[PDB]
RNA sequence: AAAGGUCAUUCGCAAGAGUGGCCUUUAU
RNA sequence: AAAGGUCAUUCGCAAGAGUGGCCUUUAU
């Protein structure tokens, strides 16, 4: 690994490393090596959920566990440890195999996302629990500064489904009517049909799912609760 | 607190509170009081999942993430977890409403699984992470010494339905034939028709998916698979 | 958090290493 | 790990606090 981009990382990150070896493996996806993160990434992931847990807890003495199970959610989703990833630009350090190199894995948000958990366990074995926890708090201050527990942290289709059910109304459906693209590169649109309203709400992304969040997001808005 | 109860309580985890209040709230159900150990419980299962995690990364240096994540979910998971609440005789310390107290309350495995995640955030308050790592790994030392990765961590179901994927066999189907009891207690049959079965075997059990499980068992045996 | 299947797809003569969509199963 | 709905059910005049089965949703 090149040793100009991995002293840059380590700036930004806060953090020097006494064993150089445990970066270079936290840094590696299968596609490049044998020698890869997917272990450290299990360690990480379970680092990152007692850190951020305990963080909530004394941060929220008052809320209860489903409000900081919910907000534990959005802190440790794939999607937020991208937004961290890209935030250190950890693209730029990642050891890719050709293949991914010439498919934008540097890109790719499930890389991105699994080696901010990898970079989490090499630290924690390079140093301590007391050491990683404290690099983990560093790099969330601003999202917990800024998070608030309540139904803000409930996803558009659990929002619309407990509108629903509360008021013994039926569930809604999600139907996909349209797949655009190849099928490893697809945008789904999705209508849902909501009880009282005259037509279906639309939605697009991804995978079925990201558009069915989309949908759900329109039903709230059209219904008048949001 | 009674000090008869909490003395015998300490003296089994191994470890003795300095905030009493901490211990008392840790072993305070919800049916007891407001103010309980809900929010102890999430605390202490991220820790719990983080030691543990921690144990298997360092005793199993060869295993890849599936094998540690299927050991750790046999070492956590809410059966182990009622396990070691028996053998610290937790039922007697359990501080209980009067609706539990006269419907065995004491005996209920999810209660009994919660209250040492409870414990388990309780100790972690009174002292600190190195201290609560220290007491769950004694805890765990035989389970920990006698654990072994492969497919014997796979649970009944998801063995069968692999042998029949692997070889683009039918997916079992698992038929509810009776349901004996009450709404709140309840004996499920389940009958699983396999290919390369003559007859449905048969599981029994107090929810549907044990049944499943029971019958999967079954299933795997009679196919000689195992 | 992991597993398996499937459709597609990046690198590769291949061997083989990945990625995306969908489904099923298990634990938290 | 949590949420909601439902069918039962323990305590309680009730208010209210629980527990089990089933379903749906979300995150790991
Ligand atoms: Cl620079
Ligand atoms: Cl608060
Ligand atoms: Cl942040
Ligand atoms: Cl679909
Ligand atoms: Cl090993
Ligand atoms: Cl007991
Ligand atoms: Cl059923
Ligand atoms: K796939
Ligand atoms: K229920
Ligand atoms: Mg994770
Ligand atoms: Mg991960
Ligand atoms: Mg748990
Ligand atoms: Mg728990
Ligand atoms: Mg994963
Ligand atoms: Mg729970």
Redesign the pocket.
Known sequence: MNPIVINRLQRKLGYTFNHQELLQQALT???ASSK?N?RL??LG?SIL?YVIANALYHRFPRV???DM??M??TL???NTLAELAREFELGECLRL????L??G?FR????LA?TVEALIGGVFLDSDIQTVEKLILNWYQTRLDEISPGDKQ??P??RL??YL??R?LP?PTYLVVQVRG?????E?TIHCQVSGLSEPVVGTG????KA?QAAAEQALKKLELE
Chains 1, 2 share one sequence.
């Open positions: 996806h299968r596609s890869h997917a990434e299990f992931d959920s209860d566990a489903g199970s919910r534990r959610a440790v989703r794939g195999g050709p293949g991914e010439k498919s894995g790719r948000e499930s890389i699994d409930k996803d289709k659990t489904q407990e059910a509360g013994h569930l190849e099928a490893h590169d697809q789904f991804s995978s079925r799912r069915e």
